[PDB]
């Protein structure tokens, strides 16, 4: 049976998934007969390619015997078998082969670090998160940033490490993730840092967020400055918001500024504010 299915492996089928099915049923036949090390050897023989393999998987001009090492089915089932059978060193080697072969997924990066975190290797989990962040540009890399920043503030690493980590994350972010990113960098600066730091971060957060959610970002900035310092500190935020916002949001900010000035009692300034609002 092993001989004839070795011949089956030799058969050049039309689809690479068929020869994938051959290799997975070879390992499956071995694991039913309690030959786990033999199955590991079989699928180590399956994906035999040099360190500089770059062949196209979908190129329907080469034989599928050679363009099968870059098939995700064999590698996924193989690394689950190695994880359930062998030790941590071999599984790390097989993931390293995944990352060398350039077929890894953000799901695979998260799986790497979850495997490390179950074995309490937190620093290497951080290392493989930001290696995945290096490999994936940014609209892919928001998910990795979510998990990585959550686990980094979970473990409570050094404060300068977290500061440089968010400054790395914020660097080339779209606004649609900049909202969340700045919200947590200000949040951490409030929780385990200095207040004026969080104030300047909320300021440049208002500066670098999308048009649709800029008004809510000034709302958060105003509420946090009111909870933090006096309303006299909240005035420059108000006239900056009038200076930068479009007409409807500037109207809303101007009405709230007039409300604050009427609350303080300096209704001459509130009247001038209302005059400006009436101008636009």
């Amino acid at each position: 049976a092993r001989i004839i299915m070795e011949k089956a492996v030799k058969v050049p089928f039309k689809s690479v998934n068929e020869l994938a099915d051959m290799w997975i049923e070879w390992a499956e036949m071995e694991l039913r007969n309690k030959n786990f090390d033999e199955a590991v050897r079989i699928m180590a023989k399956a994906t035999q390619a040099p360190k500089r393999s770059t062949v196209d998987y979908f190129d329907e001009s080469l034989s599928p015997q050679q363009r099968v090492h870059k098939s995700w089915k064999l590698w996924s089932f193989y690394v689950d078998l190695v994880e359930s059978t062998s030790s941590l060193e071999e599984t790390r080697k097989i993931y390293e082969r995944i990352f060398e072969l350039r077929i890894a997924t953000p799901q695979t990066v998260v799986n790497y670090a979850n495997l490390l975190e179950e074995h309490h290797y937190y620093e290497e989990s951080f290392k493989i998160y930001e290696r995945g962040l290096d490999l994936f540009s940014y609209p892919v890399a928001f998910e990795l940033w979510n998990l990585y920043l959550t686990k980094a503030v979970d473990r409570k690493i050094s404060i300068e490490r977290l500061r440089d980590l968010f400054e790395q994350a914020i660097t080339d972010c779209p606004p649609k993730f900049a909202k969340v990113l700045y919200l947590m960098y200000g949040n951490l600066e409030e929780e385990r840092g200095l207040a004026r730091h969080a104030m300047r971060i909320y300021e440049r957060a208002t500066r670098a967020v999308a048009d649709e959610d800029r008004a809510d970002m000034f709302n958060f900035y105003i509420t946090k400055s009111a909870s933090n310092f006096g309303l006299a500190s909240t005035r420059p935020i108000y006239e900056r918001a009038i200076a930068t916002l479009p007409d409807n949001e500037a109207r809303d900010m101007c009405l709230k500024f007039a409300d604050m000035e009427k609350r303080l009692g300096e209704i001459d300034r509130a009247r001038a504010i209302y005059g400006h609002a009436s101008q636009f």
């Binding site: 890894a104 953000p106 892919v140 998910e143």
Partner: protein
């Protein structure tokens, strides 16, 4: 007779129309549900598609 009347190229074209129709229906359902389609597709991409789209 049905196999002789139906060309396999036509069958593959109809299967591709199945695939693209299923994709656009699933896109419509996810965007109507409030979630983001491209974030989930960004969950499932390899390095190769990532750097070519980059």
């Amino acid at each position: 007779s049905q196999r002789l009347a139906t060309d396999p190229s036509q069958l593959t074209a109809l299967s591709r129309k199945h695939a693209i129709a299923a994709h656009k229906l699933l896109k419509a359902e996810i965007e109507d549900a409030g979630g983001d389609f491209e974030r989930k597709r960004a969950w499932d991409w390899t390095v190769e598609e990532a750097e070519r789209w980059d």
